[PDB]
């Protein structure tokens, strides 16, 4: 919402902040009333680039920086891949070597041309894929249930303190 | 005077001590002797930093192997200089006993703001800009550019000192901080660093808390070298604030905007050092995969691997990253939101920012930081602490929390929000100086009852007294005064704030008391607004107006510049016979500075209870968590934050050298027995019911009467 304007139509952005960016594959910042402009001809095709769009490829975020909201959907679709739990790995440099090779393929993909990073993706689809990768999204899956049952746990513990302190007071 | 003390003989420079300096001897012999952290009170501001440092010196004479060295702690480097001169006496005492030299070292420590020979430092005052302008001529850059010697300025004097203090260490002495300044300026050495060497071989060390407490620089100096070592914090009942004030963190839209363009800045300097020099600086990265200070105390700090974080361009992505997140967190308007385990749970989910890699940002930042040969670190502080925040908060929230204010208070409307990372227990960030040192004895005056202090800061106490000061004439007799003329009550109430007849009789009091007391006299309020409401309502009446004519006013101000000017004068008023009122806060920092003697702020006056305001979120965290954990009652800690506070701001007139003075707090809560309680044990005993709940009127007789008794000689 900081920013000055879309590159367009950089009037809802002083007028009203209420607007939130679209993510496209071009990694633009578009905005609502801009989409409803790319809507009306081309049916998504980035004004300027003409970068096609199968669907409008358009998806909501809310970051005033265009480069972090490419980057973090970047991040978004990368973190399905190299999901492995870091306990994985033994070998102590392997916990962060790999994490170290998965930012580069986000900065890779951020700017620089993304065939090599899909051909790379693709091995590593192939030969994780078999055993790791679906079994990390179990656990991940499992450790995302259990944090949510865990804060759930606290809140009925602040609700009970509340509650039993009124019932002291009262009582 | 030698005093056959029951553990040894004690020597002691002055003639005769009360019989509270024996107890208090006594009692501290036994926390030595038992080897176990303890706390102590004793009321007097001077005479204890000498009878303790006697105590210490002919135990440490005794025992030398059980204690390592003394670490004395004062609140301002202006009171340690204090201390460094009793020392000294000491020192020129004993050695005058002792017929030669002891290899005996005392020394104090003071920023290089405070303390410096270099003429392009001098001018400037400013802390941060002190910092990064020594860290750039002492840049290991600089040092190897100095090997070449090629044209360009370098700081010769901790060259010297690399030359000669490493291999000569200075044999003995005592060295104030401007003595140690021209010792410095005479020997072409650091009066900084050669202090700094000396803490490996001191056998006294002094220094302010905030070279012991705040883990990023307290450790480097406070290693584990003083594994058994005498710490003691003098004056230090406003430990927990200070404590607290070491780890929280205040993030402010201001700061995040200075922060986004410095992170500019650095961009384009990685830039221009890839285009320039990219080798030598990148063996960095080699160094960081084998693997401005951390604030992770020693067991809490760890250094296994940066993390993901492993490249210049890696480590400003996730800068930005965090960055973006904090500037939507601190944009978001609504009410005010507390999560510190969720603020971590939320940044990882949203951003997807990990709380490992998290955790290594600030040490990473120094070390990338370095590599960039910056000009100075000053530009780049408010980055410095936004990483110095994400990196504490990736470490633990257990005893903390993240609090958002998207809207200040005193402002119906402001776009400068701030995030605030305020502690709730000074436990926590103090533990390591407990566990590390055997002992450590808080000393202070005006001390809040002890039983309180254990329950805050998690330590087991040997001995729990309170002194009180004995005298052949009664110096202090302090009063308490809840009904004015009119026979009603004059609680400072939240409520009754606004009574127009409170505000009237705290003026008549004020007016009669200025008429009676002699010259200078001090008046402490509740708040700066609550202050101006009174004065306001006082100059539509008559009253103010015939107190200024009765003796001058002076007022105290927000801006430090203004109370400096004010007190100058004040001081001038109080030797002259005009005298003076001087109207303070009780928080002001003015309040908790100033010392007062002997004919300067000869009857000292509390206007109110001095207690926070019921609505800063702050306090809401640090009250309710001592309620969930140590069991405390959150009215009896508001209690005590009141009861110490006024002690501090009322216990200066009885500095030392017997110099008479009168207490006189224009509350009837004071009257309270809780209130009395928990006031220290030497003021509550002169205390008596007799006077506690004087009118007006009485409390002025009685004060001429008590005035006339002490102005005669001993
Ligand atoms: S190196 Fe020493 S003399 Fe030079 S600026 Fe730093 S403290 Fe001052
Ligand atoms: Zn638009
Ligand atoms: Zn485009």
């Known amino acids: ?171 | 005077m030698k005093l056959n003390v029951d553990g040894l003989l004690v020597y002691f420079p002055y003639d005769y001590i009360y019989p509270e300096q024996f107890s208090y001897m006594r009692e501290l012999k036994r926390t030595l002797d038992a080897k176990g952290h303890g706390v102590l009170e004793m009321p007097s501001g001077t005479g204890k930093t000498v009878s303790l440092l006697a105590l210490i010196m002919a135990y440490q004479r005794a025992y030398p192997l059980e204690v390592t060295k003394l670490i004395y702690c004062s609140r301002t480097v202006p009171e340690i200089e204090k201390v460094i001169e009793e020392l000294r006496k000491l020192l020129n005492f004993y050695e005058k006993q002792e017929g030669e030299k002891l290899p005996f070292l005392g020394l104090a420590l003071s920023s290089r703001k405070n303390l410096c020979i270099h003429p392009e430092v001098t001018p400037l005052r400013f802390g941060k800009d002190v910092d990064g302008k020594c860290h750039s001529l002492t840049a290991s850059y600089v040092r190897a550019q100095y090997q070449h010697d090629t044209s360009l300025p370098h700081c010769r004097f901790y060259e010297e000192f690399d030359a000669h203090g490493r291999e000569v260490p200075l044999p003995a002495g005592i060295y104030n901080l401007d003595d140690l300044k021209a010792l410095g300026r005479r020997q072409g050495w650091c009066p900084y660093f050669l202090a700094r060497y000396s803490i490996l071989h001191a056998n006294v060390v002094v220094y302010s808390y905030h070279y012991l407490l705040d883990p990023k620089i307290a450790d480097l100096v406070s290693k584990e070298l003083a594994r058994k070592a005498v710490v003691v914090f003098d004056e230090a009942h406003n430990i927990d604030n200070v404590c607290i004030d070491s780890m929280s963190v205040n993030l402010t839209r201001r700061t995040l905007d200075r922060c986004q363009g410095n992170l500019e800045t650095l961009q384009k300097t990685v830039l221009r050092i890839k285009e320039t020099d990219e080798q030598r600086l990148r063996d960095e990265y080699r160094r960081l995969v084998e693997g401005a200070n951390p604030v992770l105390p020693d067991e809490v700090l760890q250094e296994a691997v940066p993390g993901s974080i492993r490249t210049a361009e890696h480590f400003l992505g996730f800068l930005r990253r965090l960055l973006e997140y904090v500037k939507w967190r601190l944009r978001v308007q609504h009410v005010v939101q507390e999560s510190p385990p969720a603020f971590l749970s939320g940044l990882a989910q949203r951003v997807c920012i990990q709380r490992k890699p998290l955790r290594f940002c600030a040490e990473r930042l120094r070390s990338l930081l370095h590599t960039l040969e910056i000009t100075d670190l000053a530009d780049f502080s408010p980055l410095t602490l936004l990483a110095n925040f994400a990196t504490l908060v990736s470490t633990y929230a257990k005893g903390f929390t993240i609090i958002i204010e998207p809207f200040d208070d005193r402002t119906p409307t402001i776009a400068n929000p701030i995030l605030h990372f305020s502690c709730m227990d000074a436990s926590l960030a103090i533990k390591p100086v407990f566990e590390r040192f055997q002992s450590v004895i808080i000393t202070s005056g005006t001390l809040s009852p002890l039983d309180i202090y254990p329950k805050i800061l998690d330590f087991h106490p040997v001995t729990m007294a309170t002194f009180t000061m004995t005298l052949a004439r009664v110096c202090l007799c302090p009063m308490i005064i809840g009904r004015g003329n009119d026979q009603v009550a004059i609680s400072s109430k939240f409520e009754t704030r606004e009574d127009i007849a409170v505000i009237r009789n705290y003026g008549n009091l004020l007016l009669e008391m200025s008429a009676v007391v002699p010259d200078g006299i001090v008046a402490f309020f509740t708040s700066y607004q609550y202050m101006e409401s009174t004065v306001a309502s006082w100059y539509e009446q008559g009253i103010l107006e015939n107190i200024q004519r009765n003796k001058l006013l002076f007022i105290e101000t927000q801006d430090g510049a203004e109370t400096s000017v004010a007190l100058e004068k004040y001081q001038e008023a109080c030797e002259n016979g005009r005298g003076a009122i001087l109207l303070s806060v009780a928080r002001g920092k003015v309040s908790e500075g100033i010392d007062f003697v002997h004919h300067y702020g000869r009857a000292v006056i509390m206007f109110g209870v001095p207690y926070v305001y019921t609505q800063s979120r702050i306090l809401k965290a640090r009250l309710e968590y001592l309620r969930d954990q140590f069991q405390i009652r959150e009215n009896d800690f508001l209690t005590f934050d009141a009861m110490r506070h006024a002690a501090q701001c009322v216990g200066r007139a009885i500095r030392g050298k017997t110099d008479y003075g009168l207490m006189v707090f224009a509350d009837k809560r004071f009257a309270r027995g809780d209130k009395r309680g928990k006031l220290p044990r030497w003021i509550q005993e002169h205390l008596t019911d007799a006077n506690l709940n004087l009118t007006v009127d009485e409390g002025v007789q009685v004060a001429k009467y008590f005035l006339r008794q002490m102005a005669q000689p001993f």
Do not use: W
């Open chain 1, 1 to 171: 919402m900081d920013d000055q304007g879309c590159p367009r139509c950089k009037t809802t952005k002083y007028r009203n902040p209420s607007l939130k960016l679209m993510v496209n594959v071009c990694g633009h910042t578009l905005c609502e009333s801009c989409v409803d402009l790319l809507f009306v001809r081309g049916a998504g095709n980035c004004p300027e680039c003409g970068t096609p769009l199968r669907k409008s490829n358009f998806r909501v975020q809310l970051f005033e920086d265009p480069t972090v909201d490419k980057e973090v959907e970047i991040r978004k679709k990368v973190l399905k891949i190299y999901n492995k739990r870091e306990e994985d790995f033994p070998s102590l440099r392997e916990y962060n070597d790999f994490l170290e090779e998965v930012e580069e393929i986000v900065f890779n993909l951020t700017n620089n041309v993304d065939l090599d990073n899909t051909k790379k993706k693709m091995e590593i689809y192939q030969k994780e894929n078999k055993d790791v990768i679906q079994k990390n999204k179990l656990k991940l899956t499992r450790e995302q249930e259990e944090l949510e049952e865990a804060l759930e746990v606290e809140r009925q513990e602040n609700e009970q303190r509340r509650l039993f302190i009124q019932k002291e007071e009262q009582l």
